[PDB]
Amino acid sequence: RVLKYAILGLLRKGELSGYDITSYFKEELGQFWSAKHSQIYPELKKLTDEGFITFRTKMYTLTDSGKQELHDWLIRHQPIPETVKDEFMLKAYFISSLSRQEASDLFTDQLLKRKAKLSDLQGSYEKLMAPMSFSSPDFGHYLVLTKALEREKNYVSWLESILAMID
Amino acid sequence: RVLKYAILGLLRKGELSGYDITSYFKEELGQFWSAKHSQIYPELKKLTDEGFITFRTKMYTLTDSGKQELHDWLIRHQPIPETVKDEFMLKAYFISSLSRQEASDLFTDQLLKRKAKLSDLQGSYEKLMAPMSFSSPDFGHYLVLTKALEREKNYVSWLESILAMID
């Protein structure tokens, strides 16, 4: 039920259609929480049968039960997950099988793609910021944007310093 | 076949038993590439039927075919994946449903756990470094250690600066 709390959360500010919920997944949310389109409507239906959302004629809204379910999940302290899979880093672990030139080529290609990804994130940041506060309506978007930005900058920085060792 | 290239890579320096391959997963590799124990021996068997590894009496070794298969995968340029799921960041996106105090409590608990995780990584780093070079036999381990270190430092740093905004 990977989509349960994503959908409950998307509804936290009022009603949305199933189209709208899908677009929120295909846009700013499905960067850090991707959904298969084949899973949205089963989850919507399951949340309905569970009494967490209701609908009108189709526009879904949180029920009070759904609001409470969302709230309990938000404040819950969870163990931090096991490291997220990174296929490139599996390669890095096995670097003894690469020549110096092949490792340089591999890391350089990775650096290029992550700087390019960083560039897209810096664009979305300047678009969003075109004075942030806790209760600002965009604070949540600002949180995921800056986390992703910081993450790519650090990845870029690590790649550059390994390239400086390799080369 | 999530384990295919992890196992081929574990064998790149010579023969290993299935026990040894499992321990490499339960130790330094299964941090950034976890395996279910129920998947190791099916993968070993599949790689055997594929001619990528062979065995003696059970000690598995790469075949020349397996070495080539590993090599082709290493040098291949792949698209960088969609962002890795982070449940905490889904919460951060939905922060408008939290009071200031609840968000502070949530972020503070996250900061504590990631600093503690950073501490374990800094210990493994000082243990490993008890003068790194490209062809050093530990370079691969040094790559995954420093990537994970840099990653937790940046996460800690981002959490601290959000806490400085929230509080």
Q: Which residue has the tokens 């992890």?
A: B6
Annotated resolution, angstroms: 2.3
Asked whether residue A49 falls in the same domain as residue A92, the answer is no
As for how many domains chain A has, the answer is: 2
**Which of A47, A82, A117 is a domain's end point?**
A82
The two structure tokens encoding residue B112: 């504590």
Residue B5 forms contact with A (CB below 8 Å): yes
**Which of A40, A61, A82 is a domain's end point?**
A82
Asked whether residue B33 falls in the same domain as residue B48, the answer is yes
Asked whether residue A166 falls in the same domain as residue A100, the answer is yes
Q: How far apart are CA B120 and CA A20, in angstroms?
A: 43
Chain B positions in Cβ-Cβ contact with residue A148 (cut-off 8 Å): 83
Sign of dihedral through CA atoms B41, B42, B43, B45?
positive
**Which of A60, A82, A104 is a domain's end point?**
A82
Q: How far apart are CA B143 and CA B140, in angstroms?
A: 5
Asked whether residue A27 falls in the same domain as residue A75, the answer is yes
3-state secondary structure chain B: CCCHHHHHHHCCCCCEEHHHHHHHHHHHHCCCCCCCHHHHHHHHHHHHHCCCEEEECCEEEECHHHHHHHHHHHHCCCCCCCCCCCHHHHHHHCHHHCCHHHHHHHHHHHHHHHHHHHHHHHHHHHHHCCCCCCCCCCHHHHHHHHHHHHHHHHHHHHHHHHHHHHC
CB distance B140 to A92 below 8 Å: yes
Q: How far apart are CA A66 and CA A47, in angstroms?
A: 8
Asked whether residue B66 falls in the same domain as residue B91, the answer is no
Method for this entry: X-ray
CB distance A1 to A45 below 8 Å: no
- Check CB contact under 8 Å for A96 and B150: no
Asked whether residue B20 falls in the same domain as residue B99, the answer is no
For chain B, how far is it from start to end, CA to CA, in angstroms? 46
The two structure tokens encoding residue B65: 């075919």
Residues 96-135 of B with CB under 8 A from A: 96-98, 100, 102-103, 105-106, 109-110, 113-114, 117, 132-135
**Selection from B108, B158, B161 nearest residue A75 by Cα:** B108
CB distance B52 to B43 below 8 Å: no
Question: By residue range, what is the domain housing residue A53?
Answer: 1-82
Q: How far apart are CA B27 and CA B5, in angstroms?
A: 17
